[PDB]
């Protein structure tokens, strides 16, 4: 199933593929939003984004 970037709209074959695509945009992919699966290199950037799901 085409796994595409919600952000830029490129579909990948694998999740890890798109995961590395998502990693590519931020350099590296550390944390993810435990809800929507957005990768943040900063847990605080993440946190603020986590708080929009529970804020
Ligand atoms: Zn992207
Ligand atoms: Zn999120």
From Swiss-Prot:
A zinc finger (C2H2-type) spans 3-25, 31-53. It is found in: Nucleus. Expressed in germinal center B-cells. There is a cross-link at residue 38 (Glycyl lysine isopeptide (Lys-Gly) (interchain with G-Cter in ubiquitin)). Transcription factor that can function as an activator or repressor depending on its binding partners, and by targeting negative regulators of cell cycle progression. Plays a critical role in early lymphocyte development, where it is essential to prevent apoptosis in lymphoid precursors, allowing them to survive in response to IL7 and undergo proper lineage commitment. Has been shown to bind to the promoters of adenovirus major late protein and cyclin D1 and activate transcription. Required for early embryonic development during gastrulation. Homooligomerizes (via the BTB/POZ domain), multimerization is required for DNA binding. Interacts (via the C-terminal zinc fingers) with GIF1; the interaction results in the recruitment of MYB to the CDKN1A/p21 and CDKN1B promoters and repression of transcription. Interacts with TRAF2, interfering with the binding of UBC13 to TRAF2, and inhibiting TRAF2 E3 ligase activity. Interacts with MYC (via the C-terminal helix-loop-helix motif); the interaction inhibits ZBTB17 transactivation and growth arrest activities and renders it insoluble in the nucleus. Belongs to the krueppel C2H2-type zinc-finger protein family. This is Zinc finger and BTB domain-containing protein 17. It comes from Homo sapiens (Human).
């Amino acid at each position: 199933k085409p796994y595409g970037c919600e952000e830029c709209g490129k579909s990948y074959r694998l999740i890890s593929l798109l995961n590395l695509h998502k990693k590519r945009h931020s350099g590296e992919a550390r944390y993810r939003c435990e809800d929507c699966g957005k990768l943040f290199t900063t847990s605080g950037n993440l946190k603020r984004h986590q708080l929009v799901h529970s804020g």
